[PDB]
Design a protein around this ligand. Structure first.
Ligand code: A1MBD
Length: 267
């Protein structure tokens, strides 16, 4: 009933912006789910940075890494959109700070440094996801080549459902112990790039942790979030979009409205 209405609403949204909208949402209190194109492939863009952060914390918890160890990169040619790492280039940053910058500011320098030094590159990132039982995710390339988002290209893609299920496992499940999971949640809650996406779709007094992606091409953008409503079990929302042409720009408002629709479908 409410599921079918919601589907018609997304379908009309995606025709209105001349693109493709992928949705998966989970109410963890009731078990209700809503899906639209949830098994189709969408570019990850920066959204996998949220998982990269979790992988770091997994290593830290195993004591293979110290959250406080210094990461130096004084000679590096910092990638475009390294807002945080560019400021600390001279002094270095703790591992914890680098990982949270990758997440909360989508810092590309942080991303590539962490993947080259600690995660074993895209293949290692992919292995981490396989290890939690995510079979859809694949990371093939580095920043910034991974943001191309060419129609038909399966590199650097996942599906809305797998993204949602993965976030649930990492943010709410048992891959990270109690202490390290709490850090992960606070990193997600401090994301800075998501104000006009899922955050814009819920009451202001709900607590949200999210991670956005913006490929900068093919109108390709996304957002996934854990949402703690007041006095009630958490929700998980995964929103992915692509557009037909290279020069097409992404639509924050579309993402926010798809969010609104998904949330309605599962409440
Ligand atoms: B990304 O996907 O996320 C992000 C960036 C960097 C990444 N995209 C690019 O580097 C393309 C130029 C920059 C601003 C915002 C975002 C975001 O929404 O995550």
């Amino acid at each position: 009933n409410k599921s079918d209405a919601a589907a018609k609403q997304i379908k009309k949204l995606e025709e209105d912006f001349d693109g493709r909208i992928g949705v998966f949402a989970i109410d963890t209190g009731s078990g209700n789910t809503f899906g639209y194109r949830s098994d189709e492939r969408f570019p990850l863009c920066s959204s996998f940075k949220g998982f990269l952060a979790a992988a770091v914390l997994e290593r830290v918890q195993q004591k293979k890494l110290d959250i406080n160890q210094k990461v130096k990169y004084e000679s590096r040619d910092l990638e475009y959109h390294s807002p945080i790492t560019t400021k600390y280039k001279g002094s270095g940053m703790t591992l914890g700070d680098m990982a949270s910058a990758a997440l909360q500011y989508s810092d590309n320098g942080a991303t590539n440094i962490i993947m080259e030094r600690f995660l074993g590159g895209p293949e290692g990132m992919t292995k981490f996801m396989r290890s939690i039982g995510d079979n859809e995710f694949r990371l093939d390339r580095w920043e910034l080549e991974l943001n191309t988002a060419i129609p038909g290209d399966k590199r650097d893609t996942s599906t809305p459902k797998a993204v949602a299920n993965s976030l649930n496992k990492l943010a709410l499940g048992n891959v990270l112990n109690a202490k390290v999971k709490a850090i992960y949640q606070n990193w997600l809650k401090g994301n800075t790039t998501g104000d006009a996406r899922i955050r814009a779709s819920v009451p202001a007094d709900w607590v949200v942790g999210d991670k956005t992606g913006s490929c900068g091409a093919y109108g390709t953008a996304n957002d996934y979030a854990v949402i703690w409503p007041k006095n009630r079990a958490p929700l998980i929302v995964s929103i992915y979009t692509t557009r037909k042409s290279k020069d097409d720009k992404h639509s924050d408002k579309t993402i926010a409205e798809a969010s609104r629709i998904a949330i309605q479908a599962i409440d």
